[PDB]
Structure 1
């Protein structure tokens, strides 16, 4: 209107002083940031053997949520719960009913790495969950082939932090249950079928295939050009 006046700016070369912009691309980041990003990328390079290419097949979110829902039923105890049980079973059985028969048998996930490992060794395990994102990874590389040879159902999953939360811990790296009540065995089998199909049965094939090989945006598009524009 007739007091405001529309005066654009060129923002062009040799004139029209340049504005501010999103320079997140051209950042000179800190060292640790560059390190984690470049480690990720380098790991993406350098063709990965099948023994690690097992990983990065984690799950569908739907099956993930279903499984987690199952596992939440078989939580461990907490401070107050262990406190209560130990007050009561003691108070009764110590001068009363049988030692530790004065309180119910428990059910839970039976977490803990070496515990899990021994259970699998003893075939006493029923289902296994393996966080994909461990560091170091030799902790866990040997579990899938192990469970395969032992005929046990496993899956690789996401969020070792989620595993931790499942135990009221920061992280677990593992979670693998046996004790299941009769009510949940149907869902147990339901998940087992699809999961062995997805992970366990495909083991021997994935064990054949490598990973990596990727280029990255620039050289990748460049190879696409050197192939398409030239062939």
Structure 2
């Protein structure tokens, strides 16, 4: 204690070498990082047509969790299970000459953009989930309008990766329930009712309502300061 002393250096303008602070704000990021951030900034700064702001309107966490629990219950067959069903069917049709009906009727989630659009056109799907993160937006823009026209319940969910892991894929961008077992039909009905109240009953108003137009942090601060200066008496 008597040997040590109080050094403290002064970090003034021209006093001493500045300490190693966090310069994460001023990192010269790679070009692709810059394109990422600036593309997001441009998207939120331009006045997006209502197809955006009907997207980016992902359903809330609880309803998303319930939907994905039900869909995980209705998860499709995997490779090993498909192989087992295949050999069982082959044995059955080889010993009893069954008309390929030994295996039971499947109850899975029908995925794929073309397949789901055809199901909506044919009025076979009972519930649709559309990923909000589809990289080319051309593929999903028409989907809420088509679902509304065909009177089929739709919900805009968060995560094409989540949809892919739901359908045992990498990215699905769509999911659909077309048939429900009697064991969870009531849960499905309540969940689709809340999804309807969230999306279908508000389709028209949301299609009317535009989005975007949000300015940056410094721009908003300048706007507030200028307004205060203008109305200062």
Interval of TM-score (by shorter of Structure 1 and Structure 2): over 0.9
How far apart are 1:97 and its partner, in Å?
4.5
Q: Does the C-alpha gap of structure 1 residues 84 and 116 become closer, same or farther in structure 2, counting only changes over 3 Å? A: same
Structure 1 residues 31-40 or 90-99, which shifts more? 90-99
Instruction: Give, in whole Å, the separation in 2 of the partners of 1:50 and 1:144.
Output: 12
Report the 3-state secondary structure (helix = DSSP H, G, I; strand = E; otherwise coil) of the residue aligned with 2:81.
Answer: helix
How far apart are 1:44 and its partner, in Å?
0.4
Instruction: Give, in whole Å, the separation in 2 of the partners of 1:108 and 1:77.
Output: 8
Deviations 1:9-58 (A, max 9, x none): 11101111111111111111110000000000000011011122211110
- TM-score, length of structure 2 as denominator length: 0.97
Deviations 1:108-139 (A, max 9, x none): 00111111111110001100000001110100
Report the 3-state secondary structure (helix = DSSP H, G, I; strand = E; otherwise coil) of the residue aligned with 1:54.
Answer: coil
Stretches (4+) displaced over 6 A: none
Instruction: Give, in whole Å, the separation in 1 of the partners of 2:214 and 2:12.
Output: 37
How far apart are 1:95 and its partner, in Å?
3.8
Instruction: Give, in whole Å, the separation in 2 of the partners of 1:21 and 1:161.
Output: 37
Which consecutive residues of structure 2, in runs of 5 or more, have no partner in the other structure? none
- What RMSD in Å do the two structures reach over aligned CA positions? 1.0
Which consecutive residues of structure 1, in runs of 5 or more, have no partner in the other structure? none
Report the 3-state secondary structure (helix = DSSP H, G, I; strand = E; otherwise coil) of the residue aligned with 1:135.
Answer: coil
How many correspondences in the alignment? Answer: 231
Instruction: Give, in whole Å, the separation in 1 of the partners of 2:115 and 2:215.
Output: 41
Instruction: Give, in whole Å, the separation in 2 of the partners of 1:9 and 1:84.
Output: 74
Correspondence list, 1:181-200, <5 A: 181-200=181-200
Instruction: Give, in whole Å, the separation in 2 of the partners of 1:91 and 1:27.
Output: 64
Report the 3-state secondary structure (helix = DSSP H, G, I; strand = E; otherwise coil) of the residue aligned with 2:183.
Answer: helix
Instruction: Give, in whole Å, the separation in 2 of the partners of 1:141 and 1:62.
Output: 25
Report the 3-state secondary structure (helix = DSSP H, G, I; strand = E; otherwise coil) of the residue aligned with 1:207.
Answer: helix
- TM-score, length of structure 1 as denominator length: 0.97
Instruction: Give, in whole Å, the separation in 2 of the partners of 1:151 and 1:228.
Output: 49
How far apart are 1:83 and its partner, in Å?
0.5
Report the 3-state secondary structure (helix = DSSP H, G, I; strand = E; otherwise coil) of the residue aligned with 1:156.
Answer: strand
How far apart are 1:164 and its partner, in Å?
0.5
Instruction: Give, in whole Å, the separation in 2 of the partners of 1:20 and 1:31.
Output: 25
